[PDB]
């Protein structure tokens, strides 16, 4: 009762995309597998599904450039060519779904990005707290994670010991074609100077880890 995608990442506009959905927990026969995708901030979009039947079904926009195959040793695949920088950049989901039975789960999703641009690791800058970031008892600090590509990047605080008060915002794509991200946390202002606040940034695509100390200014 689990599904996982794989083989995502940065793809060139002429490239051919290939994902694999590994089903480990249920016999593939007599279980339909769907591919859905979601562009950042937008709705769900069905690509196609491969029935338990063995038959294959496609949305009209993907039928001409997509093939779904299964290798019934716990494998199903989506090939998509004519990769369009614009449209095809998105999170790709594979789901076991039964139109008629109470069996349905989706995978976590895998990021796919189409761009002639290349991978870049992030730069982490402090958002030091100051009087312009205090409000009596509370003070705001954070991280600016600037100029990285592609998504995504994960952000922790004090190695996960701080979660209440933390807002990590959706990454935004800059006029330069790179991504930028902000992570902020409200902390007690009296605690500054004695309590240390460390921003843990992980950007697996470029395999970098950073830990910026956010100090008062």
């Amino acid at each position: 009762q689990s599904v996982k995608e794989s083989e995502g990442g940065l793809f060139k506009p002429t490239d051919t995309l290939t994902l694999t959905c590994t089903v480990s927990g249920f016999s593939l026969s007599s279980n339909a597998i769907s591919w859905v995708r979601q562009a950042p901030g937008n709705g769900l979009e069905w690509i196609g599904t491969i029935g338990g039947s063995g038959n294959t079904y496609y949305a009209s926009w993907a039928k001409s450039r997509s093939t779904i195959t299964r290798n019934t040793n716990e494998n199903t695949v989506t090939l998509k060519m004519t990769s369009l920088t614009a449209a095809d950049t998105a999170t790709y989901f594979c789901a076991r779904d039964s139109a008629t039975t109470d069996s349905n789960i989706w995978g976590p999703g895998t990021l796919v990005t189409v761009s002639s641009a290349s991978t870049k690791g992030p730069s982490v800058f402090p958002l030091a707290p100051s009087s312009k970031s205090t409000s009596g008892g509370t003070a705001a600090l954070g991280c600016l994670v600037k100029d990285y590509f592609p998504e995504p990047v994960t952000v922790s605080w004090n190695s996960g010991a701080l979660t209440s008060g933390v807002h990590t915002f959706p990454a935004v794509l800059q006029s330069s074609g790179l991504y930028s991200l902000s992570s902020v946390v409200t902390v007690p202002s009296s605690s500054l100077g004695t309590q240390t606040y460390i921003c843990n940034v992980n950007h697996k695509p470029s395999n970098t880890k950073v830990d910026k100390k956010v100090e008062p200014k």
């Binding site: 599904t49 009209s60 779904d97 800058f125 402090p126 030091a128 954070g142 990454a171 935004v172």
Partner: protein, 217 residues
């Protein structure tokens, strides 16, 4: 070609209230209609299949109805946790592409709470960032409701229209508030041309716009 029209685009109700979402199909899809819930940062989860049958563990306060062309999802006993996006999709598909597993556009369920004005914090760019040739000024609007809110940057009382990036979180499942990050990006040179940097904020919970500013230095 199958099209799924989901109305309304957005609906809000207090805790303990009721919400209704309607869904239309081009032609009859019999009862092959599923309803999904998608909370921030999560795979969608299927609440309802075959139009009215509830998935395992789903509370009977989710009710699906309809057949042929017009369907409805009604959610009673609203909780803060039901702040999510809700999708219908057809579970009937063909090979000829008359039918397809098409998703509705989506409805955002907003949990109505009392109006709250943002707390405003501002962060000058970091010394370590200026060494690379860029200046980023961040304005942070924290824990407000409802989500409508405009930010305006003024350098020496000159409106900056085109070099801002806004970013906003989804509704919080605990306090039902929003947060918003705005970033003003300048070259180091253009940043050192002026002294007064200010973000003006307009929000329904404040009777007049408020400006938080700073002098470079």
């Amino acid at each position: 070609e199958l099209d799924m029209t989901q109305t309304p685009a957005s609906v809000e109700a207090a805790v303990g209230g009721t919400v209704t979402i309607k869904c239309q199909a081009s032609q009859s899809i019999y009862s092959y209609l599923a309803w999904y819930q998608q909370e921030p940062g999560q795979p969608p989860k299927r609440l309802i299949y075959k139009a009215s049958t509830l998935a395992s563990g789903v509370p009977p306060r989710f009710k699906g109805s309809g057949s042929g062309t017009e369907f409805t999802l009604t959610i009673s006993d609203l909780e803060c946790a039901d702040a999510a996006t809700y999708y219908c999709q057809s579970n009937l598909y063909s090979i000829n592409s008359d039918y397809g597993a098409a998703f509705g556009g989506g409805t955002e369920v907003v949990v109505k709470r009392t109006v709250a004005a943002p707390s405003v914090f501002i962060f000058p760019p970091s010394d370590e960032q200026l060494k690379s040739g860029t200046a980023s000024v961040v304005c942070l609007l924290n824990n407000f409701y409802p989500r409508e809110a405009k930010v305006q940057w003024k350098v020496d009382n000159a409106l900056q229209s085109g070099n801002s990036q806004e970013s906003v979180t989804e509704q919080d499942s605990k306090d039902s508030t929003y947060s918003l990050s705005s970033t003003l990006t300048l070259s180091k040179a253009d940043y050192e041309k002026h002294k007064v940097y200010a973000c003006e904020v307009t929000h329904q919970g404040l009777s007049s716009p408020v400006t938080k500013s700073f002098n470079r230095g």
